[PDB]
Design a protein around this ligand. Structure first.
Ligand code: D4C
Length: 159
Protein backbone atom coordinates (compact mmCIF):
# COMPACT_ATOMS: atom_id res chain seq x y z
CA UNK A 1 0.00 0.00 0.00
CA UNK A 2 0.96 3.66 -0.61
CA UNK A 3 0.69 6.32 2.10
CA UNK A 4 1.31 10.06 2.18
CA UNK A 5 2.63 11.64 5.36
CA UNK A 6 2.51 15.45 5.38
CA UNK A 7 2.42 18.31 7.85
CA UNK A 8 -0.22 20.88 6.93
CA UNK A 9 -0.59 24.46 8.14
CA UNK A 10 -3.78 26.56 8.09
CA UNK A 11 -5.49 26.51 4.65
CA UNK A 12 -3.78 23.15 4.02
CA UNK A 13 -0.49 24.89 3.24
CA UNK A 14 2.41 22.47 2.60
CA UNK A 15 6.01 23.52 3.14
CA UNK A 16 9.72 22.74 3.15
CA UNK A 17 10.95 22.34 6.74
CA UNK A 18 14.46 22.49 8.25
CA UNK A 19 13.00 25.38 10.27
CA UNK A 20 9.66 27.20 9.71
CA UNK A 21 6.68 25.84 11.73
CA UNK A 22 7.54 22.31 10.46
CA UNK A 23 10.60 21.69 12.68
CA UNK A 24 8.20 20.77 15.52
CA UNK A 25 10.03 18.06 17.54
CA UNK A 26 6.87 16.05 18.29
CA UNK A 27 5.89 16.04 14.58
CA UNK A 28 9.41 14.93 13.63
CA UNK A 29 8.95 12.01 16.05
CA UNK A 30 5.52 11.17 14.60
CA UNK A 31 7.15 11.24 11.17
CA UNK A 32 10.19 9.22 12.27
CA UNK A 33 7.92 6.59 13.85
CA UNK A 34 5.50 6.08 10.95
CA UNK A 35 8.31 6.33 8.43
CA UNK A 36 10.76 3.96 10.20
CA UNK A 37 11.80 0.84 8.21
CA UNK A 38 9.38 1.66 5.37
CA UNK A 39 10.63 2.70 1.89
CA UNK A 40 10.51 6.48 1.54
CA UNK A 41 9.65 8.43 -1.67
CA UNK A 42 10.27 12.19 -1.93
CA UNK A 43 11.00 15.07 -4.27
CA UNK A 44 14.24 16.88 -5.15
CA UNK A 45 13.66 19.64 -2.61
CA UNK A 46 12.31 17.41 0.19
CA UNK A 47 15.54 15.43 -0.36
CA UNK A 48 17.60 18.62 -0.17
CA UNK A 49 16.04 19.54 3.20
CA UNK A 50 17.11 16.22 4.82
CA UNK A 51 20.76 16.43 3.70
CA UNK A 52 21.31 12.80 4.72
CA UNK A 53 19.43 9.67 3.68
CA UNK A 54 16.83 8.56 6.20
CA UNK A 55 18.61 5.55 7.78
CA UNK A 56 17.63 1.90 7.49
CA UNK A 57 15.25 2.76 4.64
CA UNK A 58 15.57 2.76 0.90
CA UNK A 59 15.27 6.43 -0.17
CA UNK A 60 13.77 7.20 -3.59
CA UNK A 61 13.86 10.60 -5.30
CA UNK A 62 11.35 11.53 -8.01
CA UNK A 63 13.13 13.98 -10.32
CA UNK A 64 12.92 15.05 -13.95
CA UNK A 65 16.67 15.87 -13.57
CA UNK A 66 19.46 13.29 -13.03
CA UNK A 67 20.92 12.10 -9.73
CA UNK A 68 23.52 13.87 -7.56
CA UNK A 69 23.90 11.41 -4.69
CA UNK A 70 24.59 7.69 -4.97
CA UNK A 71 23.46 7.01 -1.37
CA UNK A 72 19.91 7.13 -2.74
CA UNK A 73 17.82 5.95 -5.69
CA UNK A 74 16.86 8.49 -8.34
CA UNK A 75 13.88 7.75 -10.61
CA UNK A 76 11.98 9.85 -13.16
CA UNK A 77 8.51 8.23 -13.12
CA UNK A 78 5.82 7.65 -10.50
CA UNK A 79 5.72 4.01 -11.59
CA UNK A 80 9.50 3.68 -11.43
CA UNK A 81 9.43 4.89 -7.82
CA UNK A 82 6.75 2.37 -6.78
CA UNK A 83 8.64 -0.48 -8.44
CA UNK A 84 11.90 0.67 -6.92
CA UNK A 85 10.40 0.11 -3.46
CA UNK A 86 10.12 -3.67 -3.87
CA UNK A 87 7.31 -5.72 -2.32
CA UNK A 88 6.75 -4.07 1.09
CA UNK A 89 3.68 -3.65 3.36
CA UNK A 90 3.78 0.14 3.13
CA UNK A 91 5.41 2.81 0.96
CA UNK A 92 5.74 6.29 2.48
CA UNK A 93 5.47 9.46 0.34
CA UNK A 94 7.34 12.30 2.05
CA UNK A 95 6.65 15.39 -0.07
CA UNK A 96 6.68 17.87 -1.27
CA UNK A 97 3.93 19.57 -3.29
CA UNK A 98 4.43 18.03 -6.73
CA UNK A 99 5.11 14.56 -5.29
CA UNK A 100 1.96 14.53 -3.14
CA UNK A 101 -0.19 15.51 -6.12
CA UNK A 102 1.34 12.69 -8.17
CA UNK A 103 0.74 9.94 -5.63
CA UNK A 104 -2.68 10.84 -4.15
CA UNK A 105 -4.60 8.76 -6.78
CA UNK A 106 -2.77 5.60 -5.73
CA UNK A 107 -2.62 6.16 -1.96
CA UNK A 108 -4.84 4.30 0.55
CA UNK A 109 -3.77 6.11 3.73
CA UNK A 110 -2.90 9.66 4.78
CA UNK A 111 -0.82 10.68 7.81
CA UNK A 112 -1.69 14.35 8.24
CA UNK A 113 -0.23 16.51 11.02
CA UNK A 114 -2.48 19.57 11.17
CA UNK A 115 -0.49 22.44 12.72
CA UNK A 116 -2.43 25.39 14.20
CA UNK A 117 -0.08 27.97 12.64
CA UNK A 118 -0.29 30.08 9.47
CA UNK A 119 2.35 30.60 6.76
CA UNK A 120 2.02 32.74 3.65
CA UNK A 121 2.51 29.93 1.12
CA UNK A 122 1.53 29.12 -2.47
CA UNK A 123 2.22 25.39 -2.15
CA UNK A 124 -0.71 23.46 -0.71
CA UNK A 125 -1.69 19.94 -0.12
CA UNK A 126 -3.87 18.07 -2.63
CA UNK A 127 -7.59 18.75 -2.03
CA UNK A 128 -8.83 15.33 -0.88
CA UNK A 129 -12.60 14.90 -1.06
CA UNK A 130 -13.90 13.72 2.36
CA UNK A 131 -16.33 11.50 0.45
CA UNK A 132 -13.46 9.07 -0.31
CA UNK A 133 -11.39 9.48 2.88
CA UNK A 134 -12.42 8.22 6.29
CA UNK A 135 -10.80 9.63 9.42
CA UNK A 136 -9.50 6.62 11.33
CA UNK A 137 -7.58 8.47 14.07
CA UNK A 138 -6.95 12.01 15.33
CA UNK A 139 -4.70 13.03 18.23
CA UNK A 140 -4.81 16.66 19.26
CA UNK A 141 -1.83 17.98 21.22
CA UNK A 142 -1.60 21.36 22.94
CA UNK A 143 1.12 23.96 22.57
CA UNK A 144 4.16 22.68 24.46
CA UNK A 145 7.55 23.97 25.67
CA UNK A 146 9.21 22.40 22.56
CA UNK A 147 6.20 22.81 20.23
CA UNK A 148 5.51 26.46 19.32
CA UNK A 149 1.91 25.89 18.22
CA UNK A 150 -0.56 23.13 18.94
CA UNK A 151 -0.85 20.28 16.46
CA UNK A 152 -3.25 17.46 15.59
CA UNK A 153 -2.15 14.09 14.25
CA UNK A 154 -4.57 12.41 11.90
CA UNK A 155 -4.76 9.23 9.86
CA UNK A 156 -7.22 8.95 6.98
CA UNK A 157 -8.01 5.94 4.82
CA UNK A 158 -9.57 5.69 1.35
CA UNK A 159 -12.90 3.82 1.29
N1 D4C B 1 4.07 15.09 9.20
C1 D4C B 1 5.35 15.20 8.52
N2 D4C B 1 5.49 14.70 7.29
C2 D4C B 1 6.65 14.80 6.65
N3 D4C B 1 6.81 14.26 5.30
C3 D4C B 1 7.76 15.43 7.30
C4 D4C B 1 7.57 15.93 8.56
C5 D4C B 1 8.65 16.59 9.26
C6 D4C B 1 9.89 16.72 8.65
C7 D4C B 1 10.09 16.21 7.32
C8 D4C B 1 9.06 15.58 6.65
C9 D4C B 1 9.57 15.20 5.38
C10 D4C B 1 10.90 15.61 5.34
N4 D4C B 1 11.18 16.21 6.50
C11 D4C B 1 12.47 16.78 6.85
C12 D4C B 1 13.26 15.82 7.73
C13 D4C B 1 12.79 14.56 8.07
C14 D4C B 1 13.54 13.72 8.88
C15 D4C B 1 14.77 14.14 9.34
C16 D4C B 1 15.24 15.41 9.00
C17 D4C B 1 14.47 16.24 8.20
F1 D4C B 1 14.89 17.49 7.84
N5 D4C B 1 6.35 15.79 9.14
Amino acid sequence: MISLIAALAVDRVIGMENAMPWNLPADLAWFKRNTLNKPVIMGRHTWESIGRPLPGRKNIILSSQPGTDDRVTWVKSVDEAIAACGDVPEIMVIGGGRVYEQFLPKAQKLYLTHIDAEVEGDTHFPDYEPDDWESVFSEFHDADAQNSHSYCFEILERR
